[PDB]
Write a protein that binds this ligand. Sequence first.
Ligand code: HEC
Ligand code: HEC
Ligand SMILES: Nc1cccc(CNCCOc2cccc(OCc3ccc4ccc(N)nc4c3)c2)n1
Ligand SMILES: Nc1cccc(CNCCOc2cccc(OCc3ccc4ccc(N)nc4c3)c2)n1
Ligand SMILES: [Cl-]
Ligand SMILES: [Cl-]
Lengths: 362, 362
Amino acid sequence: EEKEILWNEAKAFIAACYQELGKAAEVKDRLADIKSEIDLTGSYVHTKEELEHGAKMAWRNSNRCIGRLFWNSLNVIDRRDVRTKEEVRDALFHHIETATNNGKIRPTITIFPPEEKGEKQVEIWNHQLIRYAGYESDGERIGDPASCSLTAACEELGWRGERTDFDLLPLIFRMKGDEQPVWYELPRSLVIEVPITHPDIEAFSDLELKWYGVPIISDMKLEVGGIHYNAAPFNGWYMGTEIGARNLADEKRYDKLKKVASVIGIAADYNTDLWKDQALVELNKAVLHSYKKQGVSIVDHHTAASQFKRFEEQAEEAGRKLTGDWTWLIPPISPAATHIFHRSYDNSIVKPNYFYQDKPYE
Amino acid sequence: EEKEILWNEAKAFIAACYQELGKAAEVKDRLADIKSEIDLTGSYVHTKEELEHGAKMAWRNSNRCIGRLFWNSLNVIDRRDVRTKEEVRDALFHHIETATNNGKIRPTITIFPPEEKGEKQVEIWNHQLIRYAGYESDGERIGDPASCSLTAACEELGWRGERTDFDLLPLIFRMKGDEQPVWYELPRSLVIEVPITHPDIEAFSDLELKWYGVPIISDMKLEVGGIHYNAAPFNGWYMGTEIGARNLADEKRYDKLKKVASVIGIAADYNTDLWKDQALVELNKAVLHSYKKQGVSIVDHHTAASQFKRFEEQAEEAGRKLTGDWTWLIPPISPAATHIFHRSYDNSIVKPNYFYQDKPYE
Ligand code: HEC
Ligand code: HEC
Ligand SMILES: Nc1cccc(CNCCOc2cccc(OCc3ccc4ccc(N)nc4c3)c2)n1
Ligand SMILES: Nc1cccc(CNCCOc2cccc(OCc3ccc4ccc(N)nc4c3)c2)n1
Ligand SMILES: [Cl-]
Ligand SMILES: [Cl-]
């Protein structure tokens, strides 16, 4: 039956993919070779054209993503030829460098060898290639609490953090056959960081906040026509609210809101003063200003919502059925000031797509 | 079959209601009289105790309501004895007065005679008992655009608005038998209004904004044990964001955000300045401050979220299954700063409850 499920997903993907590429005539002969290759080897290998477009369709079908307007300009890097740890590490180093692009971030995905028969060729442990470590013992909260389990796993493998609030986690991944993953420190020259300042309030610098330039999700599975690419890290650019409203604001993250209220000169005592809402706005203004001043790509949630409406229009113009997750598409700051809040979306899962998968550390 | 459906809803409501009231022993004899009364008359009449508790259960089951903690203190007024237009009008005048309570708003519901066999005894046309009219001809937008259809209907019946931005709509309702509804102007002495000022910014008064004290939803159907109370207006107090983030902020409502940005001294040119978010916060701060200064009940979305968490805890403490509509429970300002944003809710419909019904004007 395992040879059946792949043949069904391949017949659905190839037909849809070749039709969108104007290659509908080449369809039937391609699945003939596919149906053979599956019968013989138990799987099949995508063309570079199928793999590139398949990764673009997967982004187009991500119901929770507000930045899908630019799905067709995704920069796909085919690294299915990788066999060694040094090749994985260099390919990841290269992804960071080419996606960063001196600040003018290029949406990029590096695609590693897919699973054979459920057996992963490379198993990435990082949630994002660039992320800050987190520590909790004592009653000391240091760094990013969301990275607490991964940090504890890295420190069993010989790594040790300086225990600042912004320790860069190392790359950590396991190869097929090896019992334990390897880890490699990130070269600081590859990692752009943005210090958070406010355009009007000079005291905002006293918070000594910063964030990294490029969010590179590295723990999701790309599924294209039945082929399971468990290791395929991708990146866009940040929407400001992800940093200002969640990463630096959540109580279970960096929890900076009352420190923000202090440096902007308002009290944090009464709910009716809306000090949290006011602090959230000034922190988010600071994030956008700081990324723009440094020359690192970022988008505000209003512009992003406008772009997503064009994606909604482009979808209907092309006859494509639009799918979306309202609960994730609305921004966490002023959601009712976007058109997204005032309409409905079908949360149906369409393939190709990106999916969660179990963490190897827990 | 119509005699069947009511017997099923009555057996479910009476059992649940009498169990919660410690009257489980009186259950079986009460439905015996009910089963007879239905066989004879085709319907049945609730006790005052069943009607009061049934209206409280309906509030407890309103998935979209964040203020459900106080469900048990609802003030129920039984007006099933009403037969004339003057009685309806006086009962509505009384509701406004007793719910307003000089500013210390009492959550109140007035319950009118229910539908017979789908035939309404009284048909309320107001969406809320106190609401502002709206006009659109010319290209003139005057008043509340959400009230445009109702205002045009009232003006066919001999009513005429002064065409200010805050014309009080008259009470308008139709009695059984009559072809057209009657309308009665609201006595200004019954209606509390709050002028919107800012605690810090004196120029905010230049906007000349105001809102009414008490939102009294008057077009929903209360369903208790199969009995359909189509006319049963109810009120709580406002959550600040309903006025500051929607009523005065939405582009299809009063659309005041760029006027707010002007009087608070910030530019409304660049999305990355987050001027809409900043204006939303200061407008919402002004709403809360203005209601508190005048002595009219209101709650901020943070306090309301805290109260709703106690309702979640009280529900589990009592063994009640909790239901809720996440998309409506999250506030439109800083939703991720509330616990509601970070959990899930079962949107199952439980009865008794309040339901939409078709407008008679359109
Ligand atoms: C180009 C800039 C870009 C922006 C801005 C962007 N995305 Fe997404 N985006 C996703 C997926 C998948 C999710 C949902 C992940 C999840 O469920 O946790 C997502 C979720 C998001 C979220 C929600 C995050 C949150 O915490 O609520 C935001 C915001 C977002 N995308 C914005 C796939 C992508 C891919 C992959 C090819 C690219 C490139 C991409 N996205 C590019 C972008
Ligand atoms: C005591 C103060 C109180 C507050 C604060 C309160 N409610 Fe609700 N509330 C509802 C219902 C029903 C809805 C959903 C109506 C709808 O679907 O449009 C609701 C919805 C709401 C909403 C959502 C409105 C929006 O536009 O998003 C808020 C906010 C709210 N309630 C707060 C029944 C009630 C009842 C009836 C007995 C009372 C009293 C009541 N509620 C009292 C309160
Ligand atoms: N309860 C709710 C309700 C509504 C919305 C949310 C949002 N959930 C909060 C963030 O928590 C997580 C947890 C796990 C994964 C995760 O992936 C974020 C992500 C993924 C891909 C991106 C691509 C580009 C980009 N710019 N950003 C991206 C962000 C977020 N939670
Ligand atoms: N797309 C979305 C997504 C999420 C949330 C919303 C919220 N929808 C906006 C408001 O639009 C309407 C339309 C029709 C009815 C209505 O009833 C408001 C109401 C009812 C009862 C109340 C009781 C007490 C109280 N204090 N307030 C109340 C408010 C709102 N829309
Ligand atoms: Cl992030
Ligand atoms: Cl309202």
